[PDB]
Amino acid sequence: SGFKAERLRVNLRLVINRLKLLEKKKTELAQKARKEIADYLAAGKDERARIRVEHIIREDYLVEAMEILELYCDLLLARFGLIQSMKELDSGLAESVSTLIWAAPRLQSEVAELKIVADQLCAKYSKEYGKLCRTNQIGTVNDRLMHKLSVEAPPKILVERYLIEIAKNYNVPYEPDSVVMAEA
Amino acid sequence: SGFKAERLRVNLRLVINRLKLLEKKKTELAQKARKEIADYLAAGKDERARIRVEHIIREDYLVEAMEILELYCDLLLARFGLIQSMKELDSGLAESVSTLIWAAPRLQSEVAELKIVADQLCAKYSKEYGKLCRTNQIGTVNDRLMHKLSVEAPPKILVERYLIEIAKNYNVPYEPDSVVMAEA
Amino acid sequence: ATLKTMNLEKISALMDKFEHQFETLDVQTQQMEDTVSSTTTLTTPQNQVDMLLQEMADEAGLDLNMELPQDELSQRLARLRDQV
Amino acid sequence: ATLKTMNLEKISALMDKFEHQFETLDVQTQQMEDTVSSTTTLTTPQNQVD
Amino acid sequence: MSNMEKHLFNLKFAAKELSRSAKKCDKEEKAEKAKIKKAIQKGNMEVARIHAENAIRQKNQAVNFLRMSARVDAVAARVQTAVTMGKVTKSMAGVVKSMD
């Protein structure tokens, strides 16, 4: 198998600590980035402000995804007894285990330990289950997290709404795209 | 193929930083150049002032073209997931990718990294598509950018209008060419 | 002798190179300064800097708002370019 | 010469690495600070500090 | 000097080095605040901002150094216990055998 329970336990703790730092850091970098949007709006460079807002939306979704994975790591730590007890997958862990396996190849650039967590879960359960997770053929990965780590561009109505609210907060004039706002 | 996603990502960032410097620098050099036009007008050397204004119009168009390419680089960075995900070209990236390929042989004198960006995009998509872009046989390159990087001389009515406005700002007498102003 | 081994064409080349390399070393310092800014992002939160600037401005008797972000010939010529 | 042996791509790489390694050394100090906090947990009871 | 006493000395030193680092940040944060004032009076708003960022960065560095200093001290206090109760245990083992 190659499964070592203390590898899984140690790395789940490391993943939580690293995600808790990245949430904080990426939240602060969004504060700095929203002022940059106001600067483009003040300069009347609205078409670039739209594209810079897509960066902020993606990092905001990412932070919300990190909060979900930090919760599923802490759930596996809370019910770690069941992992090392049974050989079958408990139904209460199914969402958590499948999601962490699905997320790992997306997040492994930033959270190196999450690669190791997924490896260990794919050792404890079958390599086959480990494949059904990565494709969500298993039909168990958390939908709300899959949405937040999608590669698609934001809805253009969201981009406009972001600009409107940033414009308000920094007291900068902005007029949204009527062609987009008609789709509301 | 020879396509490396991290080569494309790193160079897109470099292109943006370099274009942001060139915009600033070329804007400041236009301030210095417009005073030189006023000096020729004060000296009554209007026929040379016309030819020196064509330099300023071309650098002004170039700065506006740089602002467009900096926007398309930031769009590919914003939707970089789609690039490394699919093997087909997404329709939302088509303008951006074709334009960057078209612009590269024009701009590669100043922005060396933009050569590398175009090489990588011509590796990711086909070499054939890479040729259809350079000729705009692909019918997708951004028109407004192609206009701004045209090699043709400005309309002589624009040259006169530039001189008129520079003359006003520096409080220098100027009388425009009636033969040209009749074409307004 | 010197004007042979450093002719004006060779000087023109040298000068252009000199300038282009300093454009590079400016792109380089920019991206070092942005690497340090993001690495130390938690040590200087934006709102604490904005509030300190406002506090120092209040003590100086200066009405300029420090939370908010802070010529015509350029705008005239811009309009001309679009109008033709 | 210097811009060859340290080109902007190589600098970009170096800078990213620099940042990622300081993210690591922050995860490390966090877990040292939590090891000391739990080891000395009886010397500083919460209610006495409050 | 025992091998633990060498470690104890190094930890006690590191706790002080951190405490000094925190004081130095308080000193420099006070100095940068003085420079903001001058820059505002001269209307140098870009320089005012540079000093503002320094001042806020040293305010927060100080707190970090001060908190680490506290942690390293707590450790050193506990290694001190080990050093002392080592010596006591060896003395009492000696007593037990000489009385035996």
The reply to whether residue B17 touches residue C30, judged by beta carbons under 8 angstroms, is yes
Q: How far apart are CA D30 and CA D13, in angstroms?
A: 26
Q: Which residues of B touch D12 (CB under 8 A)?
A: 10, 13-14
CA distances to A47, C35, D11, D15, E44 from D5, in Å: 38, 20, 10, 15, 39
Is residue A28 within 8 A of residue C42, CB to CB? The reply is: yes
Q: How far apart are CA B106 and CA C2, in angstroms?
A: 36
Provide CB contacts within 8 A for A132, sequence distance 6+: A138
Among candidates B36, B66, B57, which has minimal Cα distance to B155? Answer: B57
The reply to whether residue D27 touches residue A25, judged by beta carbons under 8 angstroms, is no
Tell me how close the Cα of B6 comes to any Cα of chain D, in angstroms: 10
CA distances to A29, A54, B75, B100, D21 from B94, in Å: 30, 18, 11, 10, 37
Treating both helix axes as pointing N-terminal to C-terminal, what angle do D8-39 and C8-39 enclose, rounded to 10 degrees? 20
Q: How far apart are CA E71 and CA D34, in angstroms?
A: 9
Q: How far apart are CA C27 and CA C35, in angstroms?
A: 12
DSSP code of residue C68: S
Q: How far apart are CA B30 and CA C77, in angstroms?
A: 11
Decide: residue B166, CB within 10 A, 0-12 exposed, 13-18 middle, 19+ buried. buried
The reply to whether residue D31 touches residue A17, judged by beta carbons under 8 angstroms, is yes
CA distances to A61, A96, A152 from A149, in Å: 7, 16, 9
The reply to whether residue A32 touches residue C68, judged by beta carbons under 8 angstroms, is no
D-contacting chains (≥3 CB pairs under 8 Å): A, B, C, E
Asked whether the CA dihedral A127, A131, A134, A137 is positive or negative, the reply is negative
Provide CB contacts within 8 A for A4, sequence distance 6+: A120
Q: How many other CB atoms sit within 10 Å of the CB of residue A141? A: 22
- Please give the radius of gyration of chain C, using alpha carbons only, rounded to the nearest integer: 24
- Number of C–D residue contacts, CB under 8 Å: 21
Is residue B180 within 8 A of residue B157, CB to CB? The reply is: yes
B6: amino acid identity, one letter: E
φ, ψ for residue C16, nearest 5 deg: -65, -40
The experimental method, as deposited, was cryo-EM
Task: Match 């200093």 to its residue by tokens.
Answer: E69
Q: Look up residue C45 and give its two tokens.
A: 């939160």
Closest chain D residue by Cα to residue B116: D9
Q: How many other CB atoms sit within 10 Å of the CB of residue C49? A: 18
Angle at C66 between CA C60 and CA C67, to 5 degrees: 150
Treating both helix axes as pointing N-terminal to C-terminal, what angle do B46-78 and B5-42 enclose, rounded to 10 degrees? 160
The reply to whether residue D36 touches residue E67, judged by beta carbons under 8 angstroms, is no
Query: Are chains E and A in contact at 3+ CB pairs closer than 8 Å?
Result: no
Is residue B176 within 8 A of residue B41, CB to CB? The reply is: no
Is residue D4 less than 8 Å (CB to CB) from chain B?
Answer: no
Is residue C31 less than 8 Å (CB to CB) from chain D?
Answer: yes
Closest chain C residue by Cα to residue E42: C60
Is residue E86 within 8 A of residue E4, CB to CB? The reply is: yes
Among candidates B15, B77, B65, B101, which has minimal Cα distance to A59? Answer: B77
Closest chain A residue by Cα to residue B6: A109
Closest chain E residue by Cα to residue C63: E40
DSSP code of residue A76: H
What's the distance, Cα to Cα, between the start and end of chain E in Å?
A: 30
Treating both helix axes as pointing N-terminal to C-terminal, what angle do B156-169 and C72-83 enclose, rounded to 10 degrees? 160
The reply to whether residue C48 touches residue E45, judged by beta carbons under 8 angstroms, is no
H-state helical runs in chain B = 5-42, 46-78, 80-85, 94-107, 113-124, 127-134, 143-148, 156-169, 178-181
